[PDB]
Ligand binder design. Structure first.
Ligand SMILES: N#C/C(=C\c1ccncc1)C(=O)NCc1ccccc1
Length: 254
């Protein structure tokens, strides 16, 4: 009559039936040990509810500790099961921080995770508005929780019409400025920047930096142009009048 898993070694607050069920479903044996280890080392204080679900990754809330202070965290967990070809691998093209000549393809997800963490660091250093990275281990990344009282900040697409009551032109400009810093200082380009991965509290936040490439990537320039078109498409719907070439110039500084 053996226990099924070691799930109960995790501190999960409001651990009733359904919360545990969710955790049991998404956590494999390896990830569980990792979460346990991050807890034992002091980073994770208690795990909370699901924040987002996805193909490549799931994100949960946690209370935690970083640099001697309590923090609210997003705990991003990359799914460990990986296919022989993922676009995440292609996103590594030309990134000198990583050479897959020293990794086993069964552990590439750890590289995706590290890359996202290092992108967050690089972005934050360049003054781009992104969650502060805290630490990472295996397929787990811990970063600043964007929002308040365990409610994640609304994405642009969630705000929708509401953007008109918060100076929508100012918000567009805030978006552009961040793309500019990301391009000129971080030398990064988001592969698919849109209303779906930009959050807003009292300023914009770019919240998924794993889907990014360095300027050495063959598609870096196309991704950038498409990003600009994405932004223009979206913000025009709310009355913002902007020109493609102007903002592309503004980001790149010709
Ligand atoms: N990254 C990211 C997320 C989605 C995502 C995209 C692409 N792949 C996997 C997950 C996300 O919802 N994060 C929630 C969050 C992050 C940071 C602070 C507060 C709340």
């Amino acid at each position: 009559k053996k226990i099924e898993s070691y799930l109960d070694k995790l501190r999960i607050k409001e651990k009733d039936g359904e919360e545990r069920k969710i955790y049991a479903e998404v956590l494999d044996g390896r990830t569980l040990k990792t979460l346990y280890k991050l807890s034992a080392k002091g980073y994770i204080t208690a795990m909370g509810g699901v924040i987002s679900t996805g193909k490549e990754a799931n994100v949960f809330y946690a209370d935690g500790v970083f640099d001697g202070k309590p923090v609210a965290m997003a705990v991003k967990i990359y799914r460990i099961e990986t296919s022989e070809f993922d676009k995440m691998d292609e996103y590594l093209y030309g990134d000198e921080r990583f050479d897959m000549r020293r990794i086993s393809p069964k552990e590439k997800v750890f590289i995706w995770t590290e890359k996202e963490f290092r992108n967050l660091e690089r972005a934050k250093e360049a003054g781009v508005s992104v969650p502060q990275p805290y630490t990472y281990m295996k397929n787990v990344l811990l970063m600043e929780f964007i929002g308040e009282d365990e409610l994640p900040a609304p994405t642009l697409v969630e705000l929708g019409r509401e953007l008109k009551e918060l100076d929508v032109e100012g918000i567009f400009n805030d978006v552009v400025e961040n793309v500019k810093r990301l391009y000129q200082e971080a030398e990064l380009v988001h592969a698919d920047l849109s209303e779906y991965n930009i959050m807003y509290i009292d300023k914009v936040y770019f919240i998924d930096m794993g889907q990014a490439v360095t300027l050495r990537h063959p598609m870096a320039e196309s991704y950038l142009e498409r990003d600009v078109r994405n932004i223009i498409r979206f913000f025009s719907k709310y009355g913002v009048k902007a020109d493609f070439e102007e903002m592309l110039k503004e980001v790149k500084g010709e």
